[PDB]
Design a protein around this ligand. Structure first.
Ligand SMILES: [Zn+2]
Length: 37
């Protein structure tokens, strides 16, 4: 899975996760819930 997206942290609550060659962006703020790929 690959997409032209580079989910980066936005505020002091988002965290970039690392999984099967995949990445996620989870945060208390729902506006920062992103995921690479
Ligand atoms: Zn955030």
């Amino acid at each position: 899975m690959k997409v032209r997206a580079s989910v980066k942290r936005i505020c002091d609550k988002c965290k970039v996760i690392r999984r099967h060659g995949r990445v996620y962006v989870i945060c208390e703020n729902p506006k920062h819930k992103q995921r690479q790929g």
